[PDB]
Amino acid sequence: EGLIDTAVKTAETGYIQRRLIKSMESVMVKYDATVRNSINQVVQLRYGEDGLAGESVEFQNLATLKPSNKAFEKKFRFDYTNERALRRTLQEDLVKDVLSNAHIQNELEREFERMREDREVLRVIFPTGDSKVVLPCNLLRMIWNAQKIFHINPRLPSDLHPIKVVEGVKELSKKLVIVNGDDPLSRQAQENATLLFN
Amino acid sequence: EEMASDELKEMRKNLTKEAIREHQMAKTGGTQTDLFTCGKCKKKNCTYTQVTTFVVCNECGNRWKFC
Amino acid sequence: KRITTPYMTKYERARVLGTRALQIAMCAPVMVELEGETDPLLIAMKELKARKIPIIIRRYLPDGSYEDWGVDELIISD
Amino acid sequence: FLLGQSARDAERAKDILCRLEHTTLRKVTANTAIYYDPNPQSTVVAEDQEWVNVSPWLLRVELDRKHMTDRKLTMEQIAEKINAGFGDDLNCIFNDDNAEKLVLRIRIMNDDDVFLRCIESNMLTDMTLQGIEQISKVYMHLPQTDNKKKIIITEDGEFKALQEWILETDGVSLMRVLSEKDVDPVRTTSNDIVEIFTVLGIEAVRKALERELYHVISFDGSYVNYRHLALLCDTMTCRGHLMAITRHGVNRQDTGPLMKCSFEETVDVL
Amino acid sequence: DDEEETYRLWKIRKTIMQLCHDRGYLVTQDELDQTLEEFKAQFGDKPSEGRPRRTDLTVLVAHNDDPTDQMFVFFPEEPKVGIKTIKVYCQRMQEENITRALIVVQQGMTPSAKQSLVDMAPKYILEQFLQQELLINITEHELVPEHVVMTKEEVTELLARYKLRENQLPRIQAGDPVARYFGIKRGQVVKIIRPSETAGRYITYRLVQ
Amino acid sequence: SKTYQDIQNTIKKAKQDVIEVIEKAHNNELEPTPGNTLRQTFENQVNRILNDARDKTGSSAQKSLSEYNNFKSMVVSGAKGSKINISQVIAVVGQQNVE
Amino acid sequence: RQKLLKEQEEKRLREKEEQKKLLEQRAQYVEKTKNILMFT
Amino acid sequence: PGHINCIRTHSTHPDDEDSGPYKHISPGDTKVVVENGELIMGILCKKSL
């Protein structure tokens, strides 16, 4: 029985593969960063609806997906009231800045609000709570490599103001472009494409 | 149906219950255990099957395998 | 007003290396000091690393227009 | 996928299953005997049901009890249907639901001998007492995996998958199924490609094809990047209609004569 | 049947109201999601030769920005609608400046009627919908994504941005149930928005042809 | 030499169970499982019993190996083999299904 | 706190906009029921 | 080569080990841990190579 199954598979799969190859043999990604065919008919405005090669993509997880509302609040809010925690984490020359300055507090509040909006978007986009998703850059590995190179020693108070993180993330969100162009349609497409990664 | 006798009503109810039970489908077998944590629901209830051991979530229903 | 990617794709890099190697093999002037090697392909690779290949790539767009990019203008991947 | 309270209890789901399953006389009938009883009151057989109610021949179509209770039918609707389906040309004298035998009496009033045979045959083969066509039988299985369990965001935040009853038919109707009450018109897919194109739309067909392909490719535990699946789905749904990958779907495209001969039908296309 | 017929009429009315709201015609939030109790209390709940009879539950709705543009929703009683019925409907519509409409036929209309329907197309747009297709609102189905009918200005802007000819865009036939639901005709692009698992959101376009 | 005793005991238990199932089916006690006929449910029960017996025998065999064993080393390394192969070699082959 | 208050009153304005839309729709329904009546 | 950092689990890794104690020090020598391109814990198998 097994041998017969193997013989018929060896005869059928070849034809299946041949038909699959003869139907998409001219499709390609033109320099306009778009997938077309021999008749120049656009099949996808961006390859794979994102425009990324399939080689440099690794499985990851979405931390802000499927948390509990109470847990989500105590993991991405950066409470700026408990000064003891700030002294433990940040250095003394930053705790006073994060306390007195209200612009930093407003900026952090805006960051948490944007995080909540993104969580709602993920929930409405990834039903059934599937954290396992595929993205280009494995951020956890990069953070680990940075820790192991610069010798972070995660016990001492680090010198990294939250505003630095906020501005750095915003600039990196600008540098990573897929749909070049300042046109409103161009910006809308850029935001849509590079949405899950951001 | 309402005007039927007590015996007839009981027989009809028994037949209906038997038909409802027979209409169902047999549940998928497996060794249920709480040693595997399902990543799709966060619960511990689930059932496994050795063949590679396939993991089937009990409440959430997360499907996975371990080699 | 060029909108193509500012990076050199692998295809373009391979073709440029091959064409420069072919030209060098046909007794053409080099664009870098030779440290004592003879394989034309290696010389082409050295020129690519030194960004001195006298070739400009013409990327055709689907519409019909094109953009002329110079090897010493865009960033090399490898 | 059941929508109403029936999703929880199986008592209120069995009726839904019955109404979605095709039931005919053959499924409920046990014996059918024709008799040339001259006088209606004569009643060659011993049955005290015609005198109370009041052509020289009749059909005694006795029904089964177990099947009728399983599908939960009543002789009133059966008689109404059998009378309306064939016009006001017959007179079905049903029986009360108290006797042991579920006998009936079909008579015709206004070559005539075979007419009863023909009519009994064509009604027994197909009558549609309660259900829709195509759908032969319906299963009723609880979801064991997350691919079919109901998911609802709880107020606390956790998803907390719910276990609800779901049906599994053996035919394809979709259109007549979604219109039925106590049926979620949002999650009841069809598992068919050509059917959805005549119900939902081309984009829905693309999504359904993607899901079916992913299901059949990930069944053995293998993994394929979604980009390839999406590219195949779009190419099969680019011209609006579902172009077949065979020689009959790709050669119809206006690609070019030199490209069509490569795949198949060389001399024909040339 | 009586109760089932009333339920079917109510479901059809809800689907029609939702359809009109989707296209852009202004409609009450009340009638948009009215339950069946008020429907009974309104008409009479006796469709079997009673008050809630067809051709009386018709509704006329004007467009949001163009109050001069309306569209009727008829309900002919003839199971096999002919040409005389549509002819008299059109004749009665000619009094008003209305152009669009929507016919709800019990069963499939005769082929001779479709010829007449398409004949009067440039002067009076009218389409048909079998009641069997109105008992469910497809736009709410999980597989069907969220469509947006675009305007000519933005279509031209799109075509000019990518430097791509409209002929090169994907195709979608007018027979598509979504296409008839939104009333889109030939030579008109429709936006599509699908939840992308690899990119969150992905917007594509399709030209009707 | 003890694993053989466990395997033989398990096989005998499975044989007794299937014989009891057959007796019940003959005397008309095994009621039809929902969604299947009498023959279908009878076959399903028999197959489940045999598969459970095979899994028990394989587990008993696996737990009775030594770290110096080579089959187990090649299986845990994953280079070539699987646990079912060791189960078939030592404990019991199993059912020879067709179609 | 003042910003919260102004957001609340803006929501009140949107509520009043809903009221005006409702009243406009009723004011056209009074005229449209006449057509619905004369149609039959 | 280089300074690689990755975490993998061995084939014979008992599931009821991370939850209980001895998480970072496994008696069965599982829970592969590599830091700065140096193997620290675990036994290599197909899951890691």
Side-chain angles (χ1 to χ4, degrees), chain A, chain B residues 4 19 26 29-30 39 61, chain C, chain D, chain E, chain F, chain G residues 1-25 27-35 37-40, chain H:
Chain A
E1 182 192 21
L3 292 169
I4 296 165
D5 297 2
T6 302
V8 298
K9 181 173 65 175
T10 52
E12 189 67 6
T13 190
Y15 193 3
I16 293 295
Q17 183 173 4
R18 170 173 174 79
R19 293 209 305 277
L20 291 172
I21 292 170
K22 295 300 302 185
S23 62
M24 302 183 298
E25 60 181 359
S26 59
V27 180
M28 59 184 298
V29 186
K30 305 295 186 178
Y31 287 92
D32 195 5
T34 177
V35 184
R36 308 195 182 188
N37 59 331
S38 60
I39 322 182
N40 297 16
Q41 296 177 357
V42 64
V43 182
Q44 300 183 355
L45 302 179
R46 305 292 160 174
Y47 170 65
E49 305 177 355
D50 189 323
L52 302 170
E55 183 175 0
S56 300
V57 295
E58 297 70 12
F59 300 89
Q60 300 179 21
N61 50 14
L62 297 175
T64 55
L65 183 61
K66 59 175 289 186
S68 62
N69 293 328
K70 185 176 291 184
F72 178 81
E73 185 175 3
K74 63 175 63 175
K75 188 172 182 180
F76 304 92
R77 183 60 179 276
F78 191 85
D79 65 325
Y80 52 88
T81 59
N82 173 14
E83 202 184 353
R84 299 181 60 83
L86 303 178
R87 267 85 67 87
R88 292 297 305 280
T89 58
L90 291 68
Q91 296 182 359
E92 76 301 352
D93 58 327
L94 283 64
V95 303
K96 59 180 68 175
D97 298 64
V98 300
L99 263 292
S100 61
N101 185 322
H103 181 57
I104 304 303
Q105 298 185 8
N106 299 278
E107 187 65 12
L108 269 47
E109 183 62 15
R110 185 181 296 93
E111 176 183 347
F112 182 80
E113 183 63 12
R114 187 184 299 96
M115 199 72 64
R116 184 201 303 274
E117 184 63 12
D118 295 336
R119 169 172 169 272
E120 293 293 351
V121 176
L122 292 176
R123 276 189 169 185
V124 303
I125 294 292
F126 293 87
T128 65
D130 180 6
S131 172
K132 189 172 176 179
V133 64
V134 191
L135 297 173
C137 299
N138 188 15
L139 303 176
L140 301 177
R141 189 200 311 163
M142 301 297 179
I143 294 170
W144 191 2
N145 299 332
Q147 289 179 113
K148 285 288 176 292
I149 294 169
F150 297 91
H151 302 171
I152 293 296
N153 183 331
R155 178 166 305 273
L156 298 177
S158 62
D159 55 328
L160 178 61
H161 203 271
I163 192 66
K164 299 291 185 179
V165 174
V166 178
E167 63 182 0
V169 175
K170 286 182 178 180
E171 294 177 1
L172 181 56
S173 302
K174 303 294 181 61
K175 287 187 182 59
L176 310 182
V177 290
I178 301 299
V179 181
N180 186 19
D182 300 335
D183 177 301
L185 180 57
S186 176
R187 293 184 297 92
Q188 178 55 217
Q190 166 54 18
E191 188 274 353
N192 296 324
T194 308
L195 179 60
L196 180 59
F197 181 88
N198 291 334
Chain C
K1 300 185 295 302
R2 301 182 298 182
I3 59 176
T4 58
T5 182
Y7 295 93
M8 182 183 298
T9 55
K10 60 179 180 298
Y11 305 98
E12 301 170 349
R13 178 175 57 86
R15 188 170 180 181
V16 175
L17 285 173
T19 297
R20 182 61 180 180
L22 183 62
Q23 293 178 2
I24 294 169
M26 290 189 184
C27 184
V30 299
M31 300 300 179
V32 65
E33 191 279 347
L34 282 62
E35 300 292 358
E37 65 288 6
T38 60
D39 181 359
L41 205 170
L42 298 180
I43 301 176
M45 193 68 177
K46 184 181 293 186
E47 286 188 352
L48 180 62
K49 290 292 181 180
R51 304 176 63 86
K52 295 293 183 62
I53 297 174
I55 302 177
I56 59 184
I57 307 175
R58 179 173 290 184
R59 300 173 179 183
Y60 293 88
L61 285 66
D63 59 7
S65 180
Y66 58 91
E67 301 179 358
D68 298 2
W69 289 85
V71 171
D72 60 356
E73 298 182 8
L74 58 144
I75 302 176
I76 60 180
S77 62
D78 187 7
Chain D
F1 296 89
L2 302 176
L3 180 61
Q5 191 274 356
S6 304
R8 277 74 65 85
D9 62 345
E11 192 284 338
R12 298 188 65 179
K14 187 66 176 65
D15 54 358
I16 305 299
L17 189 163
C18 288
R19 191 169 68 268
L20 294 173
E21 188 277 350
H22 190 185
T23 303
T24 64
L25 290 168
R26 186 177 63 268
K27 305 302 299 303
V28 300
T29 303
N31 300 322
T32 297
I34 187 177
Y35 300 84
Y36 276 73
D37 180 69
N39 191 331
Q41 66 85 9
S42 64
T43 63
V44 303
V45 302
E47 300 300 347
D48 302 356
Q49 303 179 9
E50 196 282 340
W51 298 280
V52 67
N53 184 90
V54 179
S55 180
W57 46 66
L58 54 75
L59 296 69
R60 176 179 174 182
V61 187
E62 64 86 3
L63 302 179
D64 189 335
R65 175 167 293 180
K66 60 185 293 183
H67 299 344
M68 186 172 176
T69 56
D70 294 327
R71 287 73 175 183
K72 189 175 67 172
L73 275 58
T74 179
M75 295 187 181
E76 301 294 354
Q77 59 185 142
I78 297 172
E80 288 179 359
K81 295 181 67 58
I82 200 69
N83 179 85
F86 298 88
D88 192 335
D89 301 330
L90 298 78
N91 179 15
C92 179
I93 303 300
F94 62 89
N95 181 25
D96 301 329
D97 301 330
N98 301 332
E100 195 284 337
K101 295 293 183 300
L102 289 67
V103 301
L104 303 173
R105 291 182 175 273
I106 288 69
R107 182 186 304 274
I108 184 175
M109 60 303 297
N110 59 332
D111 58 2
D112 301 332
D113 302 351
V114 299
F115 185 88
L116 301 186
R117 185 73 62 82
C118 181
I119 201 179
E120 86 83 5
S121 301
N122 65 31
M123 73 177 62
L124 187 65
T125 52
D126 55 329
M127 184 60 187
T128 306
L129 302 179
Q130 179 178 355
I132 56 179
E133 289 65 1
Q134 293 76 34
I135 304 304
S136 60
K137 64 188 299 185
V138 186
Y139 308 149
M140 183 175 178
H141 186 260
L142 295 171
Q144 301 305 139
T145 58
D146 58 354
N147 64 334
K148 300 182 182 300
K149 293 182 177 181
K150 183 176 180 60
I151 303 299
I152 182 59
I153 285 68
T154 60
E155 74 300 354
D156 61 72
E158 297 296 352
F159 285 92
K160 188 178 177 300
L162 302 176
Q163 186 176 5
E164 306 294 354
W165 291 98
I166 56 178
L167 305 181
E168 182 67 6
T169 64
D170 292 352
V172 174
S173 186
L174 186 60
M175 174 57 64
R176 304 175 56 85
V177 178
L178 300 179
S179 61
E180 295 296 344
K181 61 177 65 176
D182 304 330
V183 175
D184 190 329
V186 178
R187 295 175 60 184
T188 295
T189 181
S190 178
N191 189 23
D192 185 335
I193 306 303
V194 64
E195 183 67 6
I196 302 177
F197 181 85
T198 56
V199 177
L200 294 186
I202 183 55
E203 211 67 9
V205 179
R206 179 186 175 278
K207 185 62 177 182
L209 200 170
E210 171 185 330
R211 290 199 308 181
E212 293 293 346
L213 183 59
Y214 179 86
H215 179 58
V216 303
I217 193 63
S218 63
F219 177 83
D220 58 1
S222 63
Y223 174 84
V224 183
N225 194 340
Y226 157 77
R227 297 184 170 80
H228 305 302
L229 311 175
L231 181 64
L232 176 57
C233 287
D234 292 330
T235 52
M236 298 174 59
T237 59
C238 182
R239 301 295 84 181
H241 59 75
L242 284 297
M243 63 185 296
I245 299 299
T246 61
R247 55 173 166 276
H248 298 272
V250 300
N251 297 324
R252 305 297 78 86
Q253 185 177 7
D254 59 333
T255 58
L258 286 302
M259 183 178 180
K260 303 175 187 179
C261 63
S262 303
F263 185 18
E264 295 183 351
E265 298 183 357
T266 297
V267 62
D268 182 72
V269 301
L270 297 172
Chain E
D1 191 324
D2 182 81
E3 184 64 12
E4 280 60 2
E5 183 173 3
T6 304
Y7 179 85
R8 294 165 58 182
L9 291 175
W10 172 74
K11 190 66 177 63
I12 290 169
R13 186 179 180 84
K14 177 179 290 299
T15 304
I16 292 293
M17 301 263 63
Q18 290 179 352
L19 191 164
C20 293
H21 179 59
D22 295 359
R23 287 189 175 181
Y25 298 85
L26 181 60
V27 182
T28 36
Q29 181 58 216
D30 177 70
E31 297 177 358
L32 182 60
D33 61 1
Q34 66 177 350
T35 62
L36 189 139
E37 181 65 8
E38 60 278 18
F39 184 88
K40 292 200 183 309
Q42 182 177 359
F43 298 94
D45 189 70
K46 184 66 175 179
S48 59
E49 302 180 359
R51 290 289 293 95
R53 63 183 302 275
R54 308 179 69 88
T55 64
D56 305 9
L57 81 183
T58 180
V59 298
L60 184 66
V61 66
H63 197 274
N64 179 271
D65 58 4
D66 181 2
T68 59
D69 184 3
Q70 302 74 3
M71 56 182 297
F72 270 109
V73 185
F74 302 142
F75 298 87
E77 289 69 345
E78 286 64 2
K80 192 70 173 181
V81 65
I83 298 177
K84 298 296 184 298
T85 60
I86 55 176
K87 185 176 181 60
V88 59
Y89 277 118
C90 181
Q91 289 292 350
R92 273 62 182 89
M93 289 174 59
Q94 187 175 357
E95 283 65 0
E96 293 67 3
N97 62 335
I98 63 179
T99 57
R100 299 181 66 86
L102 194 167
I103 311 303
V104 185
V105 300
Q106 292 289 356
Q107 301 296 353
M109 58 175 61
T110 180
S112 60
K114 300 179 181 178
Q115 302 296 351
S116 52
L117 265 66
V118 301
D119 192 331
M120 307 301 179
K123 57 174 68 176
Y124 291 96
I125 290 76
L126 73 178
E127 50 189 5
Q128 53 77 21
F129 285 86
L130 286 62
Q131 61 178 354
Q132 182 60 298
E133 298 180 357
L134 296 177
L135 295 176
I136 59 182
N137 188 336
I138 62 181
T139 59
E140 282 63 358
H141 190 262
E142 179 62 13
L143 298 175
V144 178
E146 192 274 351
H147 295 54
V148 184
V149 175
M150 293 190 302
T151 59
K152 183 178 292 184
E153 188 282 341
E154 57 185 343
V155 172
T156 56
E157 180 59 20
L158 168 62
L159 296 170
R161 196 279 184 179
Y162 294 88
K163 306 180 183 300
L164 171 139
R165 191 69 60 85
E166 76 299 347
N167 181 88
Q168 302 179 1
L169 294 176
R171 305 293 181 85
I172 177 177
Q173 59 181 14
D176 185 320
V178 181
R180 294 188 302 94
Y181 180 89
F182 283 85
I184 60 184
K185 64 180 183 300
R186 179 180 301 273
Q188 186 174 1
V189 184
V190 185
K191 186 182 293 183
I192 305 297
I193 308 180
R194 303 189 305 274
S196 169
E197 62 181 358
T198 55
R201 183 181 300 95
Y202 175 79
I203 304 179
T204 182
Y205 305 90
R206 298 205 174 187
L207 182 144
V208 182
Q209 182 178 4
Chain F
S1 65
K2 177 180 178 294
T3 308
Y4 292 152
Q5 300 301 144
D6 293 67
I7 293 161
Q8 294 296 351
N9 299 329
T10 302
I11 293 168
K12 182 172 64 178
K13 292 290 183 300
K15 287 181 180 298
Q16 182 55 222
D17 297 1
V18 296
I19 291 167
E20 293 173 356
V21 178
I22 294 167
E23 292 291 357
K24 293 171 63 177
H26 287 183
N27 296 335
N28 308 90
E29 289 74 7
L30 193 158
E31 298 295 351
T33 304
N36 295 325
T37 64
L38 186 64
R39 297 181 179 275
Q40 294 175 354
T41 183
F42 169 83
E43 296 290 354
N44 296 15
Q45 292 184 9
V46 177
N47 293 121
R48 289 191 307 93
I49 293 171
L50 294 179
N51 300 331
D52 298 3
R54 178 173 58 86
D55 298 1
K56 184 178 293 185
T57 55
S59 58
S60 56
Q62 290 292 0
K63 297 179 180 179
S64 60
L65 303 176
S66 61
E67 64 283 7
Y68 295 95
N69 174 16
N70 293 332
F71 292 86
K72 184 175 179 59
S73 62
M74 290 184 295
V75 170
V76 304
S77 66
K80 180 64 65 174
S82 53
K83 297 181 181 299
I84 186 174
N85 299 326
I86 293 175
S87 180
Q88 293 184 8
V89 171
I90 300 175
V92 63
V93 181
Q95 179 61 225
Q96 302 305 142
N97 298 279
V98 297
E99 298 183 355
Chain G
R1 188 266 187 183
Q2 312 330 315
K3 302 299 144 299
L4 168 144
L5 265 295
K6 57 92 180 181
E7 276 294 351
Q8 177 52 268
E9 63 79 20
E10 181 265 336
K11 303 318 296 156
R12 297 269 65 83
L13 305 186
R14 266 59 193 173
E15 191 277 323
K16 185 63 63 177
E17 297 164 27
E18 183 277 348
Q19 297 174 245
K20 83 169 186 62
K21 282 196 304 308
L22 176 143
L23 81 84
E24 188 281 345
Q25 185 55 262
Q28 62 181 92
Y29 268 181
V30 67
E31 198 285 341
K32 287 170 159 60
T33 181
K34 303 316 302 168
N35 189 5
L37 174 58
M38 55 165 273
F39 180 80
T40 181
Chain H
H3 300 0
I4 299 172
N5 301 324
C6 67
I7 300 174
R8 298 294 301 183
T9 178
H10 185 53
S11 177
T12 58
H13 180 53
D15 53 357
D16 64 326
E17 184 172 15
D18 57 358
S19 302
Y22 304 154
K23 180 179 183 178
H24 298 276
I25 178 175
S26 184
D29 188 357
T30 62
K31 183 62 180 297
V32 181
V33 184
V34 182
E35 301 184 357
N36 296 324
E38 300 183 3
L39 184 59
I40 307 302
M41 294 174 56
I43 304 173
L44 306 179
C45 62
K46 61 177 289 299
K47 302 298 182 181
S48 56
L49 301 179

